[PDB]
């Protein structure tokens, strides 16, 4: 990869990615306003910078996120697509990251910055499987 | 609310919130290892500082994250149970900032900041209808 590539990735939010969607347990989040979580905005930005990766992933090796750094700064409703906008501003081993930016159409919906690992997926499923209670 | 409001939140991790579950939609995301997704860790991390601002909010306020920014540093397999450690760390107007992190009995999984804004309900509600498509 190159860093100063950039990438783009849009998503049509629907209106079961609200706040309450993301944790239906929750009872104080049952009684949110109906809009884009940030939980879910920042699984989407994580998705964009996923899909950026991917042609450039070798047979048996995947990625992990590793920093999350986002403002959010305007409600995005169900209808609006979300534009994330992801530029590699760096490579380090295998460790990758990136700016992300979010707009819905209407406003700019936040932005910052994620950090993901590239990983070697038997090493780490068999971690995963040792704290496995 | 004054500085150094501390709740502690726990939370037993289910097959349901996993990397997968946060997007049904991805195929990308449709073939990671089943552990615990930033943005569901987000979620909780969130969680946790609206369980704790609760006691303090009058009825018709509410409030939304404005900001995240966070490590992901061990990962989780479901069946653990996660503690969101929140702390309250400034409180300027509509404005608090908390620390958030998380640990899973066996790691420390991911810290640093989020930020939330107080808000009323009816009014950013209408809003939201508003801007709705
Ligand atoms: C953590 C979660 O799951 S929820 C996160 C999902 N949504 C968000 O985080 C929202 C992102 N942030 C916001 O919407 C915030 O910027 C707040 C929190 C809306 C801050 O915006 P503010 O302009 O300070 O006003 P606030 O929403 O508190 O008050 C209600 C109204 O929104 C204001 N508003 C201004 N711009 C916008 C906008 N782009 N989107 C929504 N509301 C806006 C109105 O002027 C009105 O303000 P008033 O109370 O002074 O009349």
Redesign the interface.
Known sequence: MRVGERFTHDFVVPPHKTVRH??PE?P??A?????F????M???M??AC??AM?PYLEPGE?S??????????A?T????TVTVTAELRSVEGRRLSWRVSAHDG?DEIGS?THERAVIH?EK??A???Q???
Do not use: D, M, Q
């Open positions: 993301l944790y929750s104080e989040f009684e949110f306003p109906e809009v979580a940030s939980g879910f920042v699984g989407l994580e998705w996923v899909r991917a995947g992990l996120g590793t920093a999350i750094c986002v403002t959010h700064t409600a409703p169900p209808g609006l209407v910052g997926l780490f499923n971690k995963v499987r704290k496995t209670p």
